[PDB]
């Protein structure tokens, strides 16, 4: 409350663990869906069922531009990736696969880089 704080955790090397993180998700094998924004005239039904597209590059602009305020908002947009691609894709699919397993790769990081 006013003039009563919790010990002040130390963020100032935050940004540059996101950026590594999101490099390591960049440059795994499963990341292919997600690299790039979906196309949104070439993919039928993707702009009206997926109200928040995201995916890695966006993600990449906009940590690079200080457009997350906090590690929170930059896990909400990374996990916002794996989401969409459970609504829009079976579990049973490559690409379906591809984000179960890339979710459990970026949580586990996420632990182990803050937790």
Same mark, same amino acid.
């Given at each position: 409350?006013?003039?009563?704080?919790? %010990?002040?955790?130390?963020?100032?090397? /935050?940004?540059?663990?996101?950026?590594?993180?999101?490099?390591?998700?960049?440059?795994?094998?499963?990341?292919? %869906?997600?690299?790039?924004?979906?196309?949104?005239?070439?993919?039928?039904?993707?702009?009206?069922?997926?109200?928040? %597209?995201?995916?890695?590059?966006?993600?990449?602009?906009?940590?690079?531009?200080?457009?997350?305020?906090?590690?929170?908002?930059?896990?909400?947009?990374?996990?916002?990736?794996? /989401?969409?691609?459970?609504?829009?894709?079976?579990?049973?699919?490559?690409?379906?696969?591809?984000?179960?397993?890339?979710?459990?790769?970026?949580?586990?990081?996420?632990?182990?880089?803050?937790?």
């Amino acid at each position: 409350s006013m003039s009563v704080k919790k %010990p002040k955790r130390d963020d100032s090397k /935050d940004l540059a663990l996101c950026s590594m993180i999101l490099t390591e998700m960049e440059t795994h094998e499963d990341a292919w %869906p997600f690299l790039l924004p979906v196309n949104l005239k070439l993919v039928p039904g993707y702009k009206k069922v997926i109200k928040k %597209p995201m995916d890695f590059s966006t993600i990449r602009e906009k940590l690079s531009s200080g457009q997350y305020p906090n590690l929170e908002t930059f896990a909400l947009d990374v996990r916002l990736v794996f /989401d969409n691609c459970e609504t829009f894709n079976e579990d049973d699919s490559d690409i379906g696969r591809a984000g179960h397993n890339m979710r459990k790769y970026f949580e586990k990081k996420w632990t182990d880089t803050f937790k």
